[PDB]
């Protein structure tokens, strides 16, 4: 039998038209997604959004992505109270085994930053580590949170990172860990990475760095880093350092990869609850990771295109959005992109 007609495993596509999943999510999510929609139909990109909205219908997001294979999403909100529901950003990833997060911290021309000309990538494991969500209270007032680290899940991310570094001509890959204290947990992580960066991927420079010291170099001398591989937590931390380094959470493209699926989201991971509905938000993040998705499903003439649009727009002084130092609204910034785009 099988091979040609088979292929129930590529991205939903009908006579040239992809069907991508759209999950606006909470906070500036709804606005920042819209920005992309507008730039998309204004460029007449052959994709149709299947768009979903939601407490445990995080089911319907999963089920959708399982059909379409590809998605574009903002962030959901997560409670801190005890009877709160639990991430369901992580739920989405765990249930689809989208185990690899990539965040892209590259500074942008028209943006004032304290240390300029910075280009580093942070790859984190999504399903394990301190995000394993195993915890219990033995006796009252004593709580244990269990942090799982397993060879299989770790070999996986390790190869993803190197594969990624090879594909995008990155010369250095560094494992962030705390192996001097958690000798088994983070130890295993540091070994497996360096171990399989030496007997496979010999062309790439593998190294380790202790998470706290990594945090210090990142803030003080970031140019020394190229690609960083981390477990769930250290990636949130180095991530936000990188986010700040380049301007803010609104400039960071992100993507999540599993073997079968791919979900693209902002690389910084902030909801912007406070400025919801104010049309003050910055869609650079969303759009740029939206371009990442195009390159993925093979379009990328469009991607190469609409990235240059936003890149030039923000470099070109005013008409840029609030947080970069402009006075324009999400709406106005979007239209400058679609405008620059209409003349390419």
């Amino acid at each position: 039998a099988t091979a040609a007609q088979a292929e129930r495993t590529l991205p939903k596509k009908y006579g040239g038209r992809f069907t991508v999943t759209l999950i606006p999510g909470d906070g500036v999510g709804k606005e920042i997604t819209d920005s992309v929609r507008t730039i998309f139909e204004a460029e007449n990109i052959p994709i149709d959004w299947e768009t979903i909205n939601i407490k445990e219908g995080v089911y319907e997001a999963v089920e959708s992505l399982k059909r379409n294979k590809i998605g574009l999403k903002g962030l959901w909100h997560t409670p801190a109270d005890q009877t709160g529901h639990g991430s369901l950003n992580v739920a989405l990833r765990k249930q689809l085994d989208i185990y690899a997060n990539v965040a892209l911290f590259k500074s942008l021309k028209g943006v004032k930053t304290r240390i300029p000309d910075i280009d580093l990538i942070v790859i984190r494991e999504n399903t394990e580590g301190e995000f394993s969500g195993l915890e219990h209270e033995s006796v009252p007032g004593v709580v244990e949170s269990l942090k799982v680290m397993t060879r299989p899940k770790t070999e996986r991310i390790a190869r993803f990172a190197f594969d990624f570094a090879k594909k995008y001509n990155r010369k250095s890959v560094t494992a962030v860990h705390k192996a001097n204290i958690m000798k088994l947990g983070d130890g295993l992580f540091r070994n497996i990475i360096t171990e399989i960066g030496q007997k496979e991927y010999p062309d790439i420079d593998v190294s380790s760095i202790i998470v706290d010291n990594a945090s210090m170099q990142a803030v003080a001398k970031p140019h020394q880093f190229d690609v960083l591989v981390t477990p769930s937590m250290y990636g949130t931390i180095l991530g936000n350092i990188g986010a700040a380094l380049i301007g803010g959470p609104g400039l960071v493209a992100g993507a999540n990869f599993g073997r079968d699926y791919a979900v693209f989201e902002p690389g910084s991971r902030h909801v912007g609850l406070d400025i919801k509905g104010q049309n003050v938000a910055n869609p650079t993040a969303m759009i740029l990771s939206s371009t990442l998705m195009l390159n993925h499903l093979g379009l990328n003439e469009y991607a190469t295109r609409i990235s240059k649009a936003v890149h030039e727009t923000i470099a070109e002084g005013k008409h840029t959005t609030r947080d970069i130092g402009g006075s324009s609204s999400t709406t106005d910034f979007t239209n400058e992109i679609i405008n620059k785009l209409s003349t390419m």
Binding site: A80, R114, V143, S145, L146, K147, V211, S215, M216, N240
Partner: protein
């Protein structure tokens, strides 16, 4: 009023006007950096005599212990001031906290006058839990390729750190106190920490309690360090270890200027957090500033306000202005020697 929690039990040695303090010169640049402090202290007429002791570890029962000479000394004088030491079978610094009941790391990072780094107006204060959390010895191989590291969080350990934070925030006149956490995905563990602060919040009504995810604590501090110049942030062991080394990165770009204070219930040790710098040792190039500021922290902890403010507000802090002063690490040309006399002048 100094924080009730780690209160010094004064008592100057009745035979001399002075208080007794254990030193622990430490090794490497320790000796030179040390007597540098002894001299500056002498000049300002500090009610303090030095009882230097050696923490070179014994090994009672394979488990590394600390010498009786030094134990008796430090338990006696309720305070000590250690410089940097090398890496001699059970972390030396760890068995140091365990044998003296030290449970809270206090780490300030403030910009230095006349030393330009990339970040400005950074004045940060962070209290860190140094007992449990991610850093309890508890980890397990549950089977072939599977490991568990266990993060321990208790109310008892949390309570007494969070207290020292409210009380320290009060003692240095900062309105706000921020509990860094991640209740988002560590519901129970970090949740307990947070609730314990929220519950203590009420018996400290002069201070305002905020709660922040490391997510934002790191994002916001790097975008704008000054937003926390009315800070005092409290957090569990790991977030603390990282944020403090980060804060230092913001303030000075390294940590050759950073002082730490390790507060215990009745004892307390004040140390510099830089290394032994073995390669610059003896040549008189070290930079006392780090240890020196820990001296100041100590003074305040002891109650000697006037002297502390004296040695900090004037001296060092001010003498680190003019490149003829300063040390090699800050562009300066001065020696450890010339820095110390150049300091005592404005002392």
């Amino acid at each position: 009023k100094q924080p009730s929690i780690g209160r010094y039990t004064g008592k100057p040695n009745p035979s001399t006007g002075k208080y007794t303090v254990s030193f622990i010169e430490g090794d490497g640049i320790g000796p030179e950096i040390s007597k540098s402090v002894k001299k500056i202290f002498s000049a300002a007429n500090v009610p303090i005599e030095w009882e230097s002791c050696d923490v070179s570890p014994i090994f009672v029962n394979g488990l590394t212990t600390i010498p009786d000479p030094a134990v008796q000394s430090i338990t006696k004088n309720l305070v000590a001031l250690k410089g940097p030491l090398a890496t001699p079978h059970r972390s030396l610094n760890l068995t140091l906290r365990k044998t003296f009941g030290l449970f809270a790391n206090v780490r300030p990072a403030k910009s230095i006058e006349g030393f330009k780094t990339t970040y400005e107006n950074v004045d940060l204060v962070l209290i860190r839990e140094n007992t449990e959390g991610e850093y309890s010895g508890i980890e397990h191989i549950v089977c072939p390729g599977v490991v568990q590291s266990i993060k321990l969080i208790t109310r008892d350990a949390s309570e007494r750190v969070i207290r020292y934070a409210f009380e320290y925030a009060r003692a240095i006149g900062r309105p706000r106190v921020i509990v860094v956490h991640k209740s988002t995905i560590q519901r129970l563990a970090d949740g307990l920490f947070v609730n314990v602060a929220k519950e203590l919040s009420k018996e400290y009504p002069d201070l305002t309690l905020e709660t922040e995810l490391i997510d934002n604590s790191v994002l916001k501090v790097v975008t704008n360090p000054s937003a926390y110049t009315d800070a005092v942030s409290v957090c569990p062991n790991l977030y603390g270890d990282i944020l403090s080394d980060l804060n230092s990165g913001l303030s000075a770009g390294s940590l050759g200027l950073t002082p730490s204070a390790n507060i215990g219930h009745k004892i307390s040790i004040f140390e510099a957090v830089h290394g032994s710098a073995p390669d610059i040792a003896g040549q008189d190039k070290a930079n006392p500033t780090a240890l020196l500021l820990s001296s100041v922290m100590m003074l305040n902890h002891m109650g000697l306000t006037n002297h502390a403010d004296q040695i900090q507000n004037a001296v060092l802090s001010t003498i680190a202005s003019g490149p003829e002063n300063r040390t090699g690490d800050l562009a300066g040309t001065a020696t450890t020697s010339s820095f110390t006399e150049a300091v005592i002048k404005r002392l």
